[PDB]
Design brief:
165 residues, alpha+beta, Alpha-Beta Plaits, 4-stranded antiparallel sheet, 10 strands, 35% strand, elongated, repeat, nucleus, RNA binding, mRNA 3'-UTR binding
Length: 165
């Protein structure tokens, strides 16, 4: 479920602004970067657009890849491809307590390997923590361990589920 996309063949004078604006128009953007020569200032014509939702990221590619601009036919594609993302040491955890927070959940799983990233899910109406979370590990072996170490647990009502996504 990638949110990061790569853009290039961007017109030479397009600005980090026109980039963002042009990508926001499709969804809601976390951050957009235009790659500039730090010293000389000019656009190297690479763009990184990060969405909040994957939905909108998939939406952006469909609508914006191939967009004709100043004869520049820009290319929108997922920053990470299906070659690498598909091998992420990434697991779904339900059953977690509502009091835990991204960091809390992170530290409690520290003990298995290098935690690349983590997202904790909140409720739609209620808004506060849900007990479901996602966690990415450095390499697979660290995740297996969580699965073996935490799949089933405890004074709470339900057992915690750990398994690959």
């Amino acid at each position: 479920g990638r949110t990061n996309l790569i853009v290039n063949y961007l017109p030479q004078n397009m600005t980090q602004d026109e980039l963002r604006s042009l990508f926001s128009s499709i969804g809601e953007v976390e951050s957009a970067k235009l790659i500039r020569d730090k010293v000389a200032g000019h656009s190297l014509g690479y763009g990184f657009v990060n969405y909040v939702t994957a939905k909108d990221a998939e939406r952006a590619i469909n609508t914006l890849n191939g967009l004709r601009l100043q004869s520049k036919t820009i290319k929108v594609s997922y920053a990470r491809p299906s070659s690498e993302v598909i091998k992420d040491a990434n697991l779904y955890i339900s059953g977690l307590p509502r009091t835990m927070t991204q960091k809390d959940v992170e530290d409690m799983f520290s003990r298995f390997g290098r935690i690349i990233n983590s997202r904790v899910l909140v409720d739609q109406t209620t808004g506060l923590s849900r007990g479901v979370a996602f966690i990415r590990f450095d390499k697979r072996s660290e995740a297996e361990e969580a699965i073996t170490s935490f799949n089933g647990h405890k004074g709470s009502s339900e057992p915690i589920t750990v398994k690959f996504a």
